[PDB]
Amino acid sequence: MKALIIDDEPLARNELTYLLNEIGGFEEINEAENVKETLEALLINQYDIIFLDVNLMDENGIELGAKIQKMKEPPAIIFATAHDQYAVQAFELNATDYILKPFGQKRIEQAVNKVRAT
C-alpha cells in the first residue's frame, strides 16, 4: 500500500509517517507541502490513500481534494487536520475519512482499514 502525506508543517508529516510505519503495510510513504508537489507526486505514482490537511499554507486543501476526486482512479482521501469546520464539505466531496488532531495509531488504523476494500 502506498500513501502520500500532504501537510505544510514537516513535524506533522513525520508524526503521521511514524504511526503509518507502526501500523505497517506501507511499501512507500511520500510527503508534499503544497499543491505543486502533491499533483507532481500524484502524476507519477499510484497512491492507495493520501492524508491531506484542510489547508496548505494559503492553498485550499478541500478544493485540492475535490479536484483529486475527478481522477480516473483517485486514491482514498483522508483529511487529517486540527480544524473541525470542514467535515460537511469533506462528506460532500466523498472524502474517505476526516481525522481531527491530535490523533493516535488506533484512529488512523480505523481509516486505513476503512480504505482496505477491493
State the CB neighbour count (10 A cutoff) for residue 93: 17
Cα–Cα distance for residue pair 116/97, rounded to 1 Å: 13
- 10 preceded by a cis bond (ω within 30 of 0): no
Domain encompassing residue 27:
1-118
What technique was this entry resolved by? X-ray
How many residues in the chain?
118
Task: Please give the backbone phi and psi of residue 104, each rounded to the nearest 5 degrees, phi first.
Answer: -115, -175
Task: Report the interhelical angle of 105-115 vs 10-23 (nearest 10°).
Answer: 70
Cα separations (Å) of 17 from 24, 37, 69, 74? 10, 17, 23, 21
- Resolution in angstroms comes to 2.5
CATH of the domain at 10: 3.40.50.2300
**Biggest CA pair distance of the chain:** 35
Q: How many domains does the chain have?
A: 1
Residue where the block lists cell 481525522 = 99
Residues 6+ apart with CB under 8 A from 58: none
Joined together, the cell numbers standing for residue 35 give 499543491
Give, rounded to a whole angstrom, the gap between the first and last alpha carbons of the chain. Answer: 13
Identity of the amino acid at 79: F
